[PDB]
Symmetry: C2
Subunit: 711 residues, 2 copies
């Protein structure tokens, strides 16, 4: 905030020489001065920037509707109207409700005007800032010597070493002084929820429409642990989504709990869809309790809302009909929910306080909002035992947190209050929708093949487009109406190779080549399956990045039709093994990997492997207990049927836990083994496209091993 | 189509004198010529008008993106690019896909260019017109003498009488020649579905996404009769909404059928809400079948979708779970459904062909679309007996229809194909939403009281806003989530008098005074209840009418705060009885009618009267049979308990059938009698606010009579 914009030169002297004196005084007060030519120049200057902290304009040539337009753009922005001809009498109430401060044109009075402008800018900065970030900035500005942890003590240890000086010159001084610990008593403490921290969690609670809100400093991988260790005591039972994270599996291995796994649907692409409506009612839950050993009525439920590919649920249905005392939504990919009414009825915090149960939501703030990594939140909705749940939160977090992460966690919510946050969210959603409309437009504009995007055939409104059973763009057969809602900002491109009914085509490009090409040209894809990409259109995405992406896709199309060699187009993949990719064209490589997928029948195996659940011999807690006692042997992959698995098997494709720790692959679940063997067989042909299975360990001969339990 | 717009004067002569010669030739060919100054002038000229049928522009100073923008505005509009400097080579495919015809700058060649322009305009007119309207216009243009019915024979009977000449000079010649009969063999016949008529019903079937579409010429009051006489044979049973029309009651009195009445919800305002989700499942339907005499499983269902106040249903739920073989949606108030994806999943024709049942929808085209009155449609979805249903359609319609109504019925759908219809529907919805946003804005801007509008507290997106159980703006208690969707274009204003929880305030204005004031100032309200208005924001509404309405509301507020006399402000109500309204102020009148509502407790009685169903002694067909035999006596209102009603009682407020023909008011339904007596008691005090009950007949002494059956 040092940019203060003065409107145009009227022409007469008595209201220009005071303006030039104020210019000189403001430059003396370390303010950059910009000179927009007219009104629309000011509108564009304010929307394209954010460092602007003041507008000076004459109240004669520009009326007070150029206070209201800026108010629609930013409510808290100070503007400085200069009163010459309009008297006191010419002011309405709506002018008085805006951030304007009136001044006069007097020669030699520029010093007091500049001091008042500096004070107003300071008030604006101290108004828009959240309280803990405000206090941290104040503490760094009054920077005191310290004799406490951390050891760098304001980064003055990095000023006395060469590699330390490189680190210090990279990061800069303010992010070294911002790292302090709980010994600084004026900032309170995260662990005890005191002072500026307590004001911060109350601020987070207002913003996100939650009763009590927490600010985790390790991540939602730890927030899931906190929620599932509070609400699910040992010996109890949980309803965990099979579409889960590794963190929930880790939680189940720490705690002595027992699962019933929900059964999500999926298409031939490998996109993890959702649980049908039948598996949230009392009948199916009671049945699955009945045929699970050592199982009682579930006391907690964990649901991934949304999925990895951005499929929201009808959460009002869930909160009405799921008859458990605590429903947890692992909303790691949807933290931005409250800030656009598009997502109404699509999170745990949507709607009011539900009766008889506590709704948890564990937004991963760093993922889609603007926050530093390892930042997360736990929003609750209901009544919880305050000391027990506070102690459970204290149990998993560290004792001396990184205050940069905490300040970023709060500043992410502070970016969403007012009109600026609504403008951010609506701009991101509208940009995502416009990108979707041209990618379907360029599909019908181009010749031959082009990238498809997995979205409804007619989208033109800003809403979460519901997945209807009467349409076939999604691919989930016999899907329930109003249970799924596509998130517009998680754009999933598609590549040729798949037909609409689910069978495979002949000409195709698997998405690994497209992702590697985009990585070569300096744009990064989130994660790819066999024939899909994913692009997070968060609040950071502007039209520069969107156009560069669209124009990396087009250059890939041109380079693939021209059929350039692997050496020229993909040097990063060429360097994987130059002997192999020396005389190979890209069309031959794409055709070869596509034929390896087709002949081995990848999508049918990937479907039929996840439509059958492995037999739960013992709870994953018992599997971890037997793993700790050294009762694990590494049998080869083929002889794994009838054996209890000790470590989780997580195959890419698709990215969802296939075999849990403690489950047996029986003869009824042989397509699981066929899929694993097929994936190992196809991954050992072409370098750079190596097999990515978390749990299976590569040997030298080419056959993988899985840690199973001894007999 | 006679307006052809030429872009600006370049300056050089060789491309101006041919343009002036083409100007002269086009004026010789009876084309009005407009001269927009530059590009944005042309954009505004095209959006503000529709009679423009051609743009002539130079291909040098204006590129071909000013073909694409006009294409987004109107796809079929002919434009005439003049090629001078850009050669053949400078044309892309997207230019070739547009309606441009290229010409050259040659002196003396303006005659052939003007003839080609006239031919292109004729092609454009014959392209955008629907086939039957095209053939009717062609027949009138080639206007032949006739010796057949109708008797005016092209309106030449009105040219020979003074009052006939007044009628002819009012209507004009083209709407007299357009009225012909089936004797003109080249237009086919509506009754037999032949020729241009058959092409018209197939055109209607494409447009509205229906299998077979019919075009009724009496109205949906007859279309309901057609559907319920085909699908519901005599001796069978129907599931008719209690929120029905008079036409459905008339249908039930013609046919020997038996009802189970659905039970809609309602708020304290008197707005007819909707049926809960529980009354569409098999259990409640089987129960209500079991305790109804002479009743079997229902073979047809009739549902008013939407209601009178624009509350759409989740029709996918209905078409999945309502286990009847034919579901009829009386969509008289929502005919515009297909033309914006906002209404997806909110009509009978939404989604695909449902299995095992036929979905009827009977859009009243004249109501919200642009069509002449008594126009209606019957869209089916499924398989019906073609000859039996065609004979049922022939049974109720006339034999010689008004071809103006038929042409208007088809032209209403023809207004919705292309980009112009989508622009109409989206403009109407956006205008409705913007009106809603300022009426809530002016509520918080004004002093004291202001008009409220019955809508969610936060609306900023173009969607049907769902009625959520976690909010209280609607007033329907314990409402089911995603069953109701507010239609944005049926704006229901509210007046002071009601609190948010349902109880009455002290200061209030009943909506009759506001409606009468608006009628005095030349704007018409659709229909009013006790404290609500209704404004149809159809495709006809532009911002002129919206601003005039908002500014009749504001002038009423100013005149009510100033407390003008009834004589000056409401002369039309003053003339009702000048002796009574001589020395009365408007605040006293509003306070008096509000106190009459409060002391008699109108909303509680209006609620408790419709929460209790009158006892069905006999089917309404039997009631009509006993009414025809002269077995009806007129007992007074107070002694009507224990008596079988012969004629329907339809009280205003609210506008929904309260007592059906053939039903008895028992001691369990005494609040019905209390509500009727209260309404008669309050309507006999203030003139001009007389009691509007259809069925109860006013006597001279002041006590009403209802035709009941003899004992």
């Amino acid at each position: 905030m040092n940019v203060i914009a003065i409107l145009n030169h009227m022409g007469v002297y008595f209201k220009e020489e005071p303006i030039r004196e104020l210019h000189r005084a403001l430059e003396r007060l370390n303010f950059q001065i910009v000179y927009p030519n007219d009104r629309d120049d000011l509108l564009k200057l304010i929307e394209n920037n954010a460092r602007l902290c003041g507008v000076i304009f004459d109240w004669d040539k520009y009326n007070l509707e150029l206070c209201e337009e800026i108010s629609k753009m930013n409510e808290n922005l100070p503007l400085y109207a200069f009163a010459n001809t309009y008297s006191t009498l010419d002011v309405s109430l709506n002018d008085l409700r805006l951030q304007i401060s009136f001044f006069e044109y007097a020669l030699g009075a520029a010093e007091d005007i500049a001091n008042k402008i500096k004070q107003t800018t300071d008030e604006y900065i101290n108004t828009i800032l959240p309280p803990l970030t405000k206090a941290l900035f104040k503490y760094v500005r009054e920077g005191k010597y310290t004799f406490c942890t951390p050891g760098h003590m304001g980064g003055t240890a990095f000023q006395k070493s060469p590699v330390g000086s490189l680190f210090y010159d990279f990061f800069g001084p303010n992010t070294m002084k911002s790292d302090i610990s709980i010994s600084v008593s004026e900032l309170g403490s995260l662990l005890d929820h005191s002072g500026p921290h307590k004001e911060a969690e109350q601020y987070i609670a207002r913003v996100f429409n939650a009763d009590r809100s927490y600010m985790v400093t390790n991540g939602t991988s730890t927030a899931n642990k906190i929620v599932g260790m509070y609400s699910a005591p040992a010996g109890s039972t949980i309803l965990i989504d099979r579409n889960c994270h590794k963190s929930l599996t880790h939680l189940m291995m720490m705690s002595d709990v027992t699962p019933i796994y929900f059964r999500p649907t999926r298409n031939a692409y490998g996109i993890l869809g959702g649980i049908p409506q039948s598996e949230f009612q009392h009948a199916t839950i009671a049945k699955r309790v009945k045929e699970t050993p050592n199982a009682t009525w579930p006391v907690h439920a964990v649901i991934t809302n949304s999925t990895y590919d951005g499929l929201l649920y009808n959460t009002d249905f869930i909160k009405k009909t799921l008859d458990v005392k605590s429903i947890h939504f692992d909303s790691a990919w949807v933290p931005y929910t409250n800030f656009s009414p598009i997502y109404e009825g699509k999170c745990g915090m949507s709607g009011g306080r539900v009766e008889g149960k506590v709704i948890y939501e564990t937004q991963s703030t760093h993922k889609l909002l603007a926050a530093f990594s390892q930042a997360s939140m736990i929003h609750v909705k209901g009544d919880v035992n305050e000391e027990t749940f506070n102690e459970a939160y204290m149990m998993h977090t560290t004792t001396s947190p990184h205050y940069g992460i905490v300040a970023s966690t709060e500043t992410a919510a502070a970016m969403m209050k007012g009109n600026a946050g609504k403008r951010l969210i609506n701009g991101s959603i509208e940009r995502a929708i416009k990108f979707r409309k041209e990618i379907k437009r360029l599909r019908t504009e181009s010749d031959g093949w082009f990238f498809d995007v997995w979205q409804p055939d007619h989208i033109d409104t800003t809403e979460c487009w519901p997945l209807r059973s009467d349409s076939t763009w999604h691919g989930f057969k016999n899907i329930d109406n109003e249970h799924m809602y596509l998130d517009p900002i998680k754009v999933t491109l598609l590549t040729p190779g798949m037909e609409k009914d689910g069978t495979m085509s002949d000409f195709g490009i698997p998405a690994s080549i497209v992702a590697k090409y985009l990585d070569e040209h300096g744009i990064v894809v989130e994660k790819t399956g066999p024939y899909n990409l994913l692009f997070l259109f968060s609040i950071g995405i502007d039209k520069t990045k969107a156009l560069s992406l669209l124009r990396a896709l087009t250059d890939f199309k041109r380079a693939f039709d021209l059929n350039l060699r692997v050496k020229n187009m993909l040097p990063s993949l060429y360097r994987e093994d130059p002997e192999f990719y020396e005389n190979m064209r890209i069309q031959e490589l794409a055709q070869n990997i596509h034929k390896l997928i087709v002949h081995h029948n990848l999508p049918d195996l990937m479907y039929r492997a996840f439509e059958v659940l492995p037999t739960m011999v013992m709870t994953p807690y018992a599997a971890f207990q037997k793993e700790l006692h050294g009762m694990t042997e590494e049998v080869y992959l083929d002889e794994m049927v009838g054996r209890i698995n000790a470590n989780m098997i997580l195959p890419y494709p698709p990215g969802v836990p296939l075999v849990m720790p403690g489950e047996m692959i029986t003869e009824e679940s042989r397509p699981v083994l066929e899929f694993l063997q097929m994936l190992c067989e196809i991954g050992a042909h072409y370098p750079g496209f190596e097999t990515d299975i978390h749990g299976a360990y590569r040997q030298a001969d080419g056959r993988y091993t899985v840690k199973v339990l001894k007999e």
